[PDB]
Symmetry: C2
């Protein structure tokens, strides 16, 4: 059977968002079942620490386990991209490293599967260029302003 | 022959970016030629007004001409997505309206062609969800702050 890892997270905290994590996980496990996948790892940044926005620790543990080939996984399943990456440049670099190491991405709710693609990479790269240029424009406007003060 | 419109713009002003507009346009015309397209309109927001960031007037004229069916165009050619939209939610809604009215998008430099797709729409929608949620998080953090003042 095709081997997969499950990855789940909250954006803010478990207080605010925890309640829908288990509905996400159940959904992802059902999908695993219907597609005859074998789950060999589950990783979760559940927002259980006392800060406002959740970090990325288990996500980083997952990526080391991917790099190492430990479990021989073909996919990471996420609920959707916004429960995986913080912006387009993030989605892109993470996806590129994953595929470097033989691993594709399935977003269960979005219906996106990167192995059925390289159009996904082109769009993401194109949208990451939008974000970078927005940052340059903000920096340029900020230099104009610091120039009056 | 397949009929197309060309669309070009600067992000900031013609002063800063104008110089590479004509290299873009030449490229786009060459592409039109090699692909045996027939150009039936050219629209340009060239950043010739006296403001910092360029607007969207000719782009808006183009979209009315698309809605009206005037010229019977099958594609809009842009140089790349960042010379077309301001963020992912923008790329998505514009692309959806265009296709509503029978029109697809070719990004000459990115090599993206929306008619060869609906994976493009799914990714864009997924990345637009990232942006929306970033906005909600910023608004929530801002309410926390206004609550101390």
């Amino acid at each position: 059977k095709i081997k997969v890892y499950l990855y789940t997270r909250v954006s803010t905290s478990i207080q605010i968002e925890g309640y829908s994590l288990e509905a996400q996980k159940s959904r992802m496990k059902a999908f695993a079942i219907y597609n005859d996948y074998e789950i060999v790892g589950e990783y979760e940044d559940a927002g259980k620490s006392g800060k406002s926005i959740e970090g990325r620790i288990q996500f980083n543990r997952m990526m080391e386990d991917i790099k190492s080939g430990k479990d021989g996984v073909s996919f990471v399943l996420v609920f959707k991209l916004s429960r995986f990456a913080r912006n387009a440049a993030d989605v892109l670099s993470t996806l590129q490293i994953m595929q470097d190491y033989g691993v594709n991405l399935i977003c269960v709710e979005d219906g996106i599967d990167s192995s059925k693609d390289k159009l996904m990479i082109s769009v993401l790269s194109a949208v990451a260029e939008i974000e970078r240029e927005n940052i340059r424009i903000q920096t340029m406007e900020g230099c104009i302003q610091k120039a009056r003060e």
